[PDB]
Design a binder for this molecule. Sequence first.
Ligand code: HEC
Ligand code: HEC
Ligand code: HEC
Ligand code: HEC
Ligand code: HEC
Ligand code: HEC
Ligand code: HEC
Ligand code: HEC
Ligand code: HEC
Ligand code: HEC
Ligand SMILES: [Ca+2]
Ligand SMILES: [Ca+2]
Lengths: 439, 439
Amino acid sequence: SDKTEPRNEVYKDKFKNQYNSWHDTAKSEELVDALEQDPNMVILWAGYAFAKDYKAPRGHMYAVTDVRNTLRTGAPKNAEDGPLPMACWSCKSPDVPRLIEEQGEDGYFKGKWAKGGPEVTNTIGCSDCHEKGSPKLRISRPYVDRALDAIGTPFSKASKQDKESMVCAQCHVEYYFEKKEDKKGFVKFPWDMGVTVDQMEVYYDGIEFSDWTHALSKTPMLKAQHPEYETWKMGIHGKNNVSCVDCHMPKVTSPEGKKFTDHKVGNPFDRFEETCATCHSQTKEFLVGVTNERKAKVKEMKLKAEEQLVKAHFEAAKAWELGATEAEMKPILTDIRHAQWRWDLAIASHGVAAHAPEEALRVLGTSVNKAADARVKLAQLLAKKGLTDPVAIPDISTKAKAQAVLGMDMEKMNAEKEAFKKDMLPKWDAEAKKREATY
Amino acid sequence: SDKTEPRNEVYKDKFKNQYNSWHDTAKSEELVDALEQDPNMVILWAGYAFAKDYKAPRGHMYAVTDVRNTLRTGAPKNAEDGPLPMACWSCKSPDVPRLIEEQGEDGYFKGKWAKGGPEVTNTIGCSDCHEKGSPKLRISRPYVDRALDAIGTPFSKASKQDKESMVCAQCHVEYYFEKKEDKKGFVKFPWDMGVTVDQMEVYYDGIEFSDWTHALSKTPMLKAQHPEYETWKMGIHGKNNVSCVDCHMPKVTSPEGKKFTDHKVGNPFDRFEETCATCHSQTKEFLVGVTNERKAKVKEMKLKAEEQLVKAHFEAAKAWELGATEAEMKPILTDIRHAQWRWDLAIASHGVAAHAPEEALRVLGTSVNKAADARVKLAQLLAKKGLTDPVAIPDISTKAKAQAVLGMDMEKMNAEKEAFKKDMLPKWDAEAKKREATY
Ligand code: HEC
Ligand code: HEC
Ligand code: HEC
Ligand code: HEC
Ligand code: HEC
Ligand code: HEC
Ligand code: HEC
Ligand code: HEC
Ligand code: HEC
Ligand code: HEC
Ligand SMILES: [Ca+2]
Ligand SMILES: [Ca+2]
């Protein structure tokens, strides 16, 4: 393109060190089946693509295999097969700013996932955060800019230290999918109101948005996704503009002598003597062991906010199954909507504990003061509908008992996924070999 | 007798720095009626001491003025009288070690409150932290050094920072008088498990202790009384050995030029240098935004905890009035005791917004999660009992409107105290100067 290059090896030389640390984002390769880890989420996302494959994020060289080989996109056969629209790339490849340059936005967006599938082939790449070649940094998706001009802080008109955290937040944020036909599958950041879990919840609620309808309690359920920049602005780090780069891209020196920026983006503790060493008088073993303590006072309340949530869908699933009305089930599924939305947001980023854990726990607190306002109103209605006992909760100890409790054909899913893994995928990588070897 | 000195005023001249600062705790008379400002404590401390009178904690020259006055203490007619016992003078004056060091603890706590009326007069001061004349921090109390010996850190160990925060730890702690016949009336701190909210729970339980049986929900209630050390131990500076002295007793520089520790104990922002300045490099008002944002996240979740509890107490007098057996209301009532305990600890130290906020929020979170399990249990139960429309809560909007909901004659509580504040108090102040003549 005029503006965007996606072939990531053109810069292996002429940016020698900065390239090979960007390859060290293949130094973190581990499927973390967080559906087998916390099988109480199979049951809370009861009726979404998440009941099928949630994983902790791994390296940055895997953004393209993973967005393919996750059970959340199935075995498509045609260029509209597959449930999820195109825009499920967006945050995986410089083959996204490339194709927003070449067809406006709309030409990228409208269309199912696999249609543009043989066109995204590079992993997360250089011209994503940077200009073409140039050492400068750009925003290479136009919604991200449109989204800043809603919170207050335009890219070019905001300090270098501001920008340090930005280009991290073209991707790592929370997003819906614009339901109008003129925006048929755009990405868009729900900031507009603000970014407290309270301000977002009030936004979506104006536009009665639903990512799905809870296939257990029939609640208009919201799905929080990677709220990184959005929680980072609440932690006393980001209260003083500790950049996203200041920790996850630590400006190191070469064996030889000159300073670059390490482009491996892993755990800032792999480069402690380099990241959080530089702004502190502490030791590691002290600071790491204190982050592993926050990483568990967030863990415990994450669970005793789910146990009231499972115990509520089923305390609502019964409420349906005695025939309650819409009129009756209104302000219950209002509460369950909110109570689970707060639970998702507070811990939909795997580092709210590191980044802003004070706000983690207040959110998780109001995700229970709501679930309460539900399970009270769900048992008072189970009374005036003739139940006075409490509802049972079947064996959801494994992922495979909780997945199978939903009548899911998790076999026909796996069957076709590693079928299409070894059937279409050879083509997408080959048909793109064709064109993208001609520049 | 030898090691104490009740008049800290006898050293006014060898230390005018250490005494004219010490004396400025009296430049602090903001008395806020924390029941005029939350009628939902009234209901939560229903049938207990602080149903009558809770106040702000003002400066130290008032503790023997405040504890002579807080309607909790009541109106003894002689000194075989009084609602409360000895161990209330424990933390309110220097006359206190002068009593254990004349006869021992047996001889102290075995008594009524107004038994030792005109024996404790001089308000808080020197020999409560010091060796008579010596500018050194001894532990004036013995129940302290026995609890400190039960957490593995007696006073001898104590790197000079540990020490520093231990002499605040004799009075700024969570305490219970003991019930058992042989250690009867003695103060005891519940650290045997111990320091944390969860660790004082296993203790206060396994041993079957109960500050009072609630008058609405007929719960065996628990009081949580101003724990600073324990919350402070969990806060970030706690984990960095940043003694209570740094923030509240900075080293203010003399008018002559000396550099003496400030003995006016109060605010770290009525001294933003010497305090926060020696560590954190931001403006006085940036670091004041935080501790207030952090203060009113707790205020939101604290109130959204009393939110449930106040309901669940009335949700329990009905289920009693609708006639329940003891055997029904059993686990429902232990949850209540577990809710309004974790809540009360989370928010008893008039500034845990500042010390560990993250821990008050997790603790405040567990409260609402534990009140939540109770109300469903109360919901199903009141349902089998002919109640299905939700339990109604009456106007409890002011102190004096909620105080008169629990039936309380504040005139025959104010009248009996406007005589005790007029008669039997300059009658103690009389024999004060008499017993203080023999010095
Ligand atoms: C040693 C363990 C401490 C004791 C005992 C107390 N604190 Fe603190 N302190 C600090 C701040 C920033 C505040 C904010 C005051 C407010 O806005 O309410 C406080 C306040 C208190 C209070 C309440 C104040 C009042 O009643 O007006 C009490 C009872 C109290 N402190 C006791 C700062 C710090 C600090 C700096 C890191 C430390 C180590 C402590 N406080 C520790 C103690
Ligand atoms: C810019 C807003 C970012 C982004 C996009 C991320 N961070 Fe952080 N983070 C820091 C530390 C010490 C951890 C602990 C890691 C662990 O315990 O495993 C994290 C956590 C993350 C993760 C999860 C790691 C993983 O493998 O998933 C991610 C994806 C992440 N962060 C992205 C340190 C900091 C930090 C200091 C508190 C700041 C500021 C940032 N990171 C900023 C960002
Ligand atoms: C930018 C706004 C993104 C869009 C649009 C989509 N994803 Fe993403 N993805 C993004 C981030 C910041 C991360 C890592 C953080 C995390 O908490 O996971 C990911 C990761 C994934 C993964 C791997 C983990 C997993 O869930 O298995 C998958 C499979 C994935 N993303 C799929 C996916 C789909 C189906 C999308 C369309 C809804 C999609 N992503 C959009 C950033 C962004
Ligand atoms: C987004 C996740 C990035 C990817 C992928 C790559 N880089 Fe990058 N790089 C990124 C940022 C936000 C910065 C900070 C620059 C600054 O000083 O503000 C950098 C650093 C650079 C620079 C300039 C400064 C430096 O430290 O070297 C250049 C010229 C650079 N990186 C080049 C580069 C190339 C060629 C990459 C593909 C191999 C690459 N980076 C990966 C963000 C991201
Ligand atoms: C869109 C191209 C992204 C941009 C720009 C940034 N990140 Fe991201 N990241 C993205 C995805 C889709 C994933 C999923 C990983 C997977 O394969 O499932 C990730 C992952 C991370 C991780 C985890 C890395 C690890 O070793 O586990 C981190 C720490 C991370 N991302 C941080 C991060 C930072 C700090 C960024 C600004 C430089 C950044 N990312 C940009 C997508 C995208
Ligand atoms: C300079 C750019 C910093 C780096 C690198 C890290 N932190 Fe930090 N931290 C910084 C500031 C300005 C503050 C505010 C306190 C102050 O002294 O002004 C902090 C505060 C913390 C906290 C407490 C609050 C929280 O968000 O949990 C922690 C736990 C903390 N810092 C830890 C930490 C660690 C382990 C780091 C390396 C990964 C780290 N910080 C980086 C500035 C900077
Ligand atoms: C028991 C003898 C105490 C010891 C030891 C310390 N304090 Fe105290 N403090 C005590 C009482 C009974 C009160 C309230 C008095 C009243 O009239 O209501 C206080 C008050 C404070 C305050 C608030 C003072 C103000 O100006 O508002 C603070 C900030 C405080 N206490 C802190 C503190 C510290 C850090 C101590 C150890 C150095 C300490 N106190 C000792 C009782 C006792
Ligand atoms: C030392 C372990 C104490 C004992 C025993 C008692 N209290 Fe005290 N009190 C103490 C502190 C550290 C504070 C400040 C925190 C707060 O919540 O205010 C207080 C506060 C008071 C006050 C001021 C207003 C009020 O809280 O009602 C009074 C009047 C008071 N305390 C009196 C009092 C009584 C009657 C006690 C026996 C039940 C008692 N205190 C116990 C420290 C300690
Ligand atoms: C506990 C609440 C205290 C009471 C009561 C009094 N002071 Fe104190 N003293 C206190 C602290 C925290 C320290 C710090 C020791 C250090 O190393 O900094 C001290 C020390 C002193 C000193 C030493 C001089 C100095 O370094 O400031 C003196 C002369 C002293 N204390 C005298 C003193 C007097 C006369 C008091 C009654 C008017 C008094 N102290 C009360 C804490 C406490
Ligand atoms: C040196 C003795 C300190 C004084 C005086 C104060 N603080 Fe502190 N602070 C100190 C340390 C060693 C740390 C750990 C992280 C770091 O590397 O600096 C902190 C951290 C904070 C935090 C964040 C965590 C929290 O408990 O909320 C805040 C908000 C903070 N510091 C502010 C603060 C204020 C307002 C102070 C005056 C009362 C203050 N600190 C005193 C060290 C020291
Ligand atoms: Ca969304
Ligand atoms: Ca108690």
